[PDB]
C-alpha cells in the first residue's frame, strides 16, 4: 500500500516551520527549522529539495528533504517574492516577484526569461500537470495562460505574450487548480467576487460560473473532476457536484442545494484545500490556527490538528522514496541560482534505459546459439 | 428613349418588394453593362447604386454537445 503525507506550515513558526505528519496516524515524519513560510510559497523540487519563500522578505530558502537545518543557498530576487512553484518534472523553478514572473532552470542554474504583463502583484502560480503550460494570476483580476514552449525559445527581442488572457473577474484572484493533462486540461480560477469559474486550457472558453455567498479563497478539484471544493471567507467549505450538472452555465449555490453539501466547523477563512488520491479525505487549512481532515463522503470531521498562528500552506502528497528512506543523499546539488538575466547542461547520463536489461530467456538463447555455432 | 422608360420601371417595383427583385437578377446586371458598353450614363448610375444596395440590404436582412461534423463522403 502507498503512503500519504500532509505537509503543513504555520505563519508564526515558534519552533518548527514545515511539519510533515502521516495522514491516517497523525504521527510526525519530518520537521524543518528556519524562517517563516509564505502564502502559496512552498514547492518540492524534483522530490529532493523543499524550497520555500519568505514572509515579507525577498529571498527563497532551500531545505534538503532529509535535513532539519537550512542550507546555505538562498535564491535572491530584486523585490518581494509573492508566490513560488516548481515544475512537476523538476526541470524548471518558477517564482513571482512583484509583477514579474522570473523563470529559472534547475539544470544549469540560469535565469532564462523575466516575463512581465500583469499590471499589479502576482498572487497565484500553478503548473499544468504535464509541465507544458503554467497559469499565472494576480491582484489585477487577470488570469493568463502562458506556454512553456513559446516563452523559452523566444527571441530576446520578441517580448513573449500569453496564449490566453482570461479577464472575467472583477476582484483579485486567490487560488487556481490546473488538473492533469496538458493541452486538454481545465483550470478552476477563483476570485474575491464570490465566484468560482472553470475554464478550458485548449480553446480558452468559460464553462461554469458558480456564484457563492461569501468570497472564495481556495479551490481544489478531484483528480477525475467530480467535485469542486470551494472554500469560503467565513469558514464553510462549499462543495459543487460537476457530474449531476443541472444543465446551465451560470449557476447559483442556494438553488444548487445546501446544508447537505457544505462542510462546517471552521471559524475563519480557509486559505488551503487539497483532496487525497482516492478522494475520500480532504485536508483544509485556515486562519483560525487549525488544520483538520474531512470525510467528503459523509461531511464529517476526523481530526483537528492545531498549529500556531494562521496556516499558510497545506497539501496532501504521495510520499516519495525520499521521506521513507533515512539517508537519500540527493542525486545532484542545487546550482547557483542567478539573479541577472543570463550550452552547458549538467545532467547524469544513462537514465533513458533504466531497466532495459536482457531477460533470462534472452541470455539463455544467446548462449545456446553460441554453443550451436561453436559446435558446427 | 425606350430603355430609359424601362429603367424608370425598375425603380418603381424596387421600392415595394425589394427582397424578391434579387431572386432572378442574373441577366439584368449584364443588361446595365450592355447599354454603357455621359448624362445618359449618369441616370443609369443613380439606380445602379440602388441596384447594388439591394443585394447588400437584402442579403444582410459548454452546455451543448457540439459534436455535429461537416465531413461528407461525396
From Swiss-Prot, chain A:
It comes from the Eukaryota. The keyword Zinc does not apply. InterPro entries: G-protein_beta_WD-40_rep (IPR020472), WD40/YVTN_repeat-like_dom_sf (IPR015943), WD40_repeat_CS (IPR019775), WD40_repeat_dom_sf (IPR036322), WD40_rpt (IPR001680), WDR18/Ipi3/RID3 (IPR045227), Wdr18_C_dom (IPR026987). Coiled coil: none annotated. Keywords: Cytoplasm, Developmental protein, Nucleus, Repeat, WD repeat. It is found in: Nucleus, Nucleolus; Nucleus, Nucleoplasm; Cytoplasm; Dynein axonemal particle. One of its GO terms (cellular component) is rixosome complex. Its main location: nucleus. WD repeats lie at residues 34-73, 76-114, 117-156, 168-209, 211-255, 265-304. GO terms for biological process: DNA-templated DNA replication; rRNA processing. Belongs to the WD repeat IPI3/WDR18 family. Component of the 5FMC complex, at least composed of PELP1, LAS1L, TEX10, WDR18 and SENP3; the complex interacts with methylated CHTOP and ZNF148. Interacts with NOL9. Component of the PELP1 complex, composed of at least PELP1, TEX10 and WDR18. The complex interacts with pre-60S ribosome particles. Functions as a component of the Five Friends of Methylated CHTOP (5FMC) complex; the 5FMC complex is recruited to ZNF148 by methylated CHTOP, leading to desumoylation of ZNF148 and subsequent transactivation of ZNF148 target genes. Component of the PELP1 complex involved in the nucleolar steps of 28S rRNA maturation and the subsequent nucleoplasmic transit of the pre-60S ribosomal subunit. May play a role during development. This is WD repeat-containing protein 18. It comes from Homo sapiens (Human). The lineage of its organism: Eukaryota, Metazoa, Chordata, Craniata, Vertebrata.
Swiss-Prot record, chain B:
The lineage of its organism: Eukaryota, Metazoa, Chordata, Craniata, Vertebrata. The chain holds residues 155 to 298 of 929 of the full protein. Functions as a component of the Five Friends of Methylated CHTOP (5FMC) complex; the 5FMC complex is recruited to ZNF148 by methylated CHTOP, leading to desumoylation of ZNF148 and subsequent transactivation of ZNF148 target genes. Component of the PELP1 complex involved in the nucleolar steps of 28S rRNA maturation and the subsequent nucleoplasmic transit of the pre-60S ribosomal subunit. Belongs to the IPI1/TEX10 family. The gene is TEX10. Component of some MLL1/MLL complex, at least composed of the core components KMT2A/MLL1, ASH2L, HCFC1/HCF1, WDR5 and RBBP5, as well as the facultative components BACC1, CHD8, E2F6, HSP70, INO80C, KANSL1, LAS1L, MAX, MCRS1, MGA, KAT8/MOF, PELP1, PHF20, PRP31, RING2, RUVB1/TIP49A, RUVB2/TIP49B, SENP3, TAF1, TAF4, TAF6, TAF7, TAF9 and TEX10. Component of the 5FMC complex, at least composed of PELP1, LAS1L, TEX10, WDR18 and SENP3; the complex interacts with methylated CHTOP and ZNF148. Component of the PELP1 complex, composed of at least PELP1, TEX10 and WDR18. It comes from Homo sapiens (Human). It is found in: Nucleus, Nucleoplasm; Cytoplasm; Nucleus, Nucleolus. This is Testis-expressed protein 10.
